[PDB]
Design a protein around this ligand. Structure first.
Ligand SMILES: CC(=O)N[C@@H]1[C@@H](O)[C@H](O[C@@H]2O[C@H](CO)[C@@H](O)[C@H](O)[C@H]2NC(C)=O)[C@@H](CO)O[C@H]1O
Ligand SMILES: CC(=O)N[C@@H]1[C@@H](O)[C@H](O[C@@H]2O[C@H](CO)[C@@H](O)[C@H](O)[C@H]2NC(C)=O)[C@@H](CO)O[C@H]1O
Length: 516
């Protein structure tokens, strides 16, 4: 089924509508005339759809008509500009890098009084190490502006300066990136002296991981403990408490983790170490067969998804009742997940007929993937237009559909069919599992690709033997989306294996992550 640009302009803005516009663009079916008013028809004007629309109607990067005159000057003529213009252009470190030293000296004097931030950056670029100058001034705004201009600057930072960095918005991304990418060793070492009192949440957690990479177990514990107290989400507290336990072995930390309301690999593992029973899994078995809702209409999903996410408790009860059927099971569970404020464990097995002939281990891996990929929503579409329950990228759906399986009249929209999503999932998982073995490694490869995963596993510091392995390697997976994905799919895998009467101890999975 196709949609002309004119039928799509009549639908609500949504990722479904973006997907179908992008499909017209990649087939060259959007004329220059069709492309005129088309910005106002796009839900998320980012990535492929934007670079594709800009091949037709290039945009000039809007500069505020207020400062338009300020962008007629260059480094050769900036001294002929009024003071407002001078200060605007000096927002760019590249512009500053481009000026000659004499003009940097001049502008530094102009701005010493009302803008010492600018004076500091101008005089810093008159030296061969701008970072060393900014660090000596303990200018925090300047530090992050330089870091963002170039990652290559690296210097030791003293205790007074590191303890100021966390008060700035940039700190979280800065800490996450240098620790996970293993860049800026002098920055990394310096961050050992951050007082756990001056950090919280993700920044506290990554500083714990940092402290472990230097075998500073006392500092790591203090950071993870501050992470555990401050984190909003129970899943992240559990991750932090797991590290407090693994470092200092207080049996109270392990008890608190085994009693967690969050079902995740850390609480599952703690329950197994304390002989605590498996957590309660909800049984969803609606008597009603189907309803008037089309589970194959991607537009219908985007509309009802928006409704559900914006529903008061009362509206959730009306929706719970409409969607309490076997054909709309995945939407029922989505509504109940919200209606019970994410307190109950829902692990549905919808369109089960399509997978009952696979062995129970494979069933559990497929179900684990689909639950995290889509929550079993057949017309699920990602911001990168991954499609259906198993979230295939088009290139991959088409490679399997046309080139490998030669399905007649194949279209990538077939990924919206449960029969197809499950079938393609099985096929793709066979390819990944034959090369990778561990379901955690398959999870990384499924989300981030097998190239990425082979490159990570080849490193001699990832998933090798060590004190805190394999748990530390799972915190050092370089692509964040893939690091979170693996943990979540692993937990899902453990649960589905349990529901299918094919239980495995998560301790066996952790042992098989270490390469012997
Ligand atoms: C915190 C969390 O796990 N959030 C879930 C989302 O991640 C999930 O979206 C899916 O995430 C995958 C990576 O984990 C992507 O590969 C996948 O394309 C993406 N799917 C969609 C539809 O964007 C959503 C799915 O409903 O649920 C969140 O709870
Ligand atoms: C289910 C799905 O569509 N997964 C996508 C990944 O497959 C994809 O990774 C790439 O997959 C190719 C097909 O097997 C590999 O040949 C390729 O090497 C791999 N890329 C890398 C960097 O390893 C990723 C990103 O392209 O997106 C997923 O959604």
């Amino acid at each position: 089924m196709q949609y002309s640009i004119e039928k799509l302009k009549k639908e609500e803005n949504s990722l479904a509508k973006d997907y179908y516009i992008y499909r017209l663009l990649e087939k060259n079916k959007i004329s220059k005339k069709d492309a005129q008013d088309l910005n106002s028809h796009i839900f998320r004007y980012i990535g492929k759809i934007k670079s594709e629309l800009e091949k037709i109607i290039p945009l000039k990067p809007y500069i505020n008509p207020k400062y338009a005159k300020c962008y007629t000057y260059t480094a050769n003529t900036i001294l002929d500009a009024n003071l407002t213009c001078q200060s605007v252009r000096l927002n760019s470190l590249v512009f500053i890098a481009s000026l000659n030293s004499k003009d940097r000296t001049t502008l530094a004097q102009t701005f010493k009084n009302q803008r010492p931030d600018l004076t500091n950056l101008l005089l810093a670029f008159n030296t061969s190490d701008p970072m060393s100058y900014i660090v000596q001034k303990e200018d925090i705004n300047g530090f992050f502006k330089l870091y963002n201009y170039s990652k290559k600057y690296d210097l030791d930072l003293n205790t007074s300066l590191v303890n100021k960095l966390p008060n700035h918005i940039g700190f979280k991304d800065f800490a996450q990136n240098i620790i996970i990418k293993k860049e800026n060793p002098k920055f990394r070492h310096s961050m050992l002296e951050i007082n756990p009192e001056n950090v919280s949440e993700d920044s506290a957690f990554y500083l714990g991981v940092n402290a472990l990479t230097y075998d500073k177990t006392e500092l790591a514990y203090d950071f993870f403990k501050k992470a555990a107290q401050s984190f909003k989400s129970q899943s992240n507290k559990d991750n932090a408490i797991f590290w407090m336990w693994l470092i200092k072995n207080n049996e109270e930390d392990l008890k608190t983790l085994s009693q967690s309301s969050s079902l995740n690999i850390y609480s599952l593992y703690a329950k197994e170490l304390t002989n605590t029973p498996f957590p309660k899994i909800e049984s969803l078995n609606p008597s009603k067969k189907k309803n008037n809702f089309n589970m194959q209409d991607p537009f219908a999903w985007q509309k009802i998804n928006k409704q559900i996410r914006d529903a008061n408790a009362s509206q959730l009860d009306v929706l719970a009742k409409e969607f309490d059927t076997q054909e709309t099971l995945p939407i029922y569970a989505y509504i109940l997940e919200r209606k019970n404020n994410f307190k109950k464990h829902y692990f549905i097995m919808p369109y089960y007929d399509n997978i009952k002939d696979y062995n129970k281990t494979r069933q559990a891996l497929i179900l684990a993937i689909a639950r995290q990929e889509s929550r079993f929503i057949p017309t699920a579409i990602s911001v990168s237009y991954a499609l259906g329950m198993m979230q295939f990228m088009p290139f991959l759906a088409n490679h399997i559909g046309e080139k490998e399986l030669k399905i007649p009249n194949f279209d990538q929209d077939f990924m919206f069919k449960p029969e197809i999503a499950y079938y393609f999932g099985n096929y793709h998982l066979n390819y990944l599992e034959s090369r990778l073995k561990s379901p955690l490694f398959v999870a990384y490869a499924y989300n981030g690709g097998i190239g990425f995963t082979n490159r990570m596993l080849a490193r001699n510091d990832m998933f090798k033997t060590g004190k805190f392995e394999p748990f530390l390697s799972m915190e050092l997976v370089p692509y964040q989306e893939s690091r979170i994905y693996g943990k979540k799919v692993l937990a899902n895998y453990i649960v589905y294996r349990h529901l299918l009467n094919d239980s495995i101890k998560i301790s066996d999975i952790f042992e098989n992550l270490i390469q012997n």
